[PDB]
């Protein structure tokens, strides 16, 4: 950190190490800048530049720590849309990260743990600030995590298909049904649960859903 110094030379060295990309040395400045001066005139911007130092150094719980600091330091601020962006943006990096993506192996169906948390913050962002510079960005992520939930919830419906729990197939399909309409995976879940009906010999209850397939052919 920084010893007891003038705050602006700490703040200059904070913004230098952000422009240097030395996020740790910006973290060295910005925290001790707010450790002695949380009453700083940029101490709100410090917490934003902390998240800028944290996320660009991929310090995801520390970015969320600077979020909850900024929640406590600025419970009202213009940049809470930034916070509701940097909440959902952090959890997206917090949910799934792997180098296997070029091989056709992806983590979009393993567990949407922080992806559901990123869904909440981003949907809060596009609800609490549908005017920000962050609500337009978050929407395609909210589009994305809906699919990441759709990839997740199809595979468990796929799991009980090889298991043979056909009540669980219909329930996990209805999990896709009752949560997001705008997914082809839910549309392919539409034959998947009527199979479960026919394995339960509910062919009549099945073919109602084939009409829904006939309805959702478009």
């Amino acid at each position: 950190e920084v010893p007891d110094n003038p705050p602006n030379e700490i703040y200059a060295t904070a913004q230098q190490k952000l422009q240097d990309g030395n996020w740790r040395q910006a973290i060295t400045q910005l925290e001790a800048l707010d450790n002695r001066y949380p009453f700083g005139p940029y101490s709100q911007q410090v917490q934003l530049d902390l998240i800028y130092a944290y996320y660009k150094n991929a310090d995801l719980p520390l970015a969320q720590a600077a979020i909850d600091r900024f929640i406590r330091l600025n419970p009202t601020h213009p940049n809470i849309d930034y916070v509701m962006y940097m909440r959902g943006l952090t959890n997206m990096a917090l949910d799934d990260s792997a180098l296997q993506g070029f091989f056709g192996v992806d983590r979009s169906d393993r567990d949407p743990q922080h992806a559901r948390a990123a869904f909440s913050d981003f949907s809060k962002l596009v609800r609490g600030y549908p005017n920000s510079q962050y609500t337009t960005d978050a929407t395609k992520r909210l589009v994305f995590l809906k699919d990441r939930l759709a990839k997740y919830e199809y595979s468990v419906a796929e799991y009980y298909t090889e298991r043979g729990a056909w009540v669980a197939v219909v329930n996990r399909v209805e999990g896709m049904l009752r949560d997001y309409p705008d997914t082809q995976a839910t549309r392919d879940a539409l034959p998947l649960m009527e199979n479960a009906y026919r394995q339960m010999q509910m062919n009549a209850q099945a073919e109602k859903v084939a009409k829904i397939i006939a309805a959702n052919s478009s």
Binding site: R163, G164, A165, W166, V167, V170, N171, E174, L177, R178, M200, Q201, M202, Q205, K208, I212
Partner: protein, 87 residues
Amino acid sequence: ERVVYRPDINQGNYLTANDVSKIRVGMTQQQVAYALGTPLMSDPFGTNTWFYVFRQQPGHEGVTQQTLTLTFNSSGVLTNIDNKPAL
């Protein structure tokens, strides 16, 4: 294919014959659900068809099911006790 062993596939969510005699055509959904609760599958887009369907597979000896579906009206009043055996 020519095995005797197989780990069995099992599946609850059903009702008994005591639960069959617990209900009758005319019974409200709640009056079914007083001692039977809700099924773990119902009919979402149509009328209330309370699916209490037993399923099980015995290992390399056939298949079994008790499909007991309980259709209700819009008022949730019982219209059929539809017990169905295997296949």
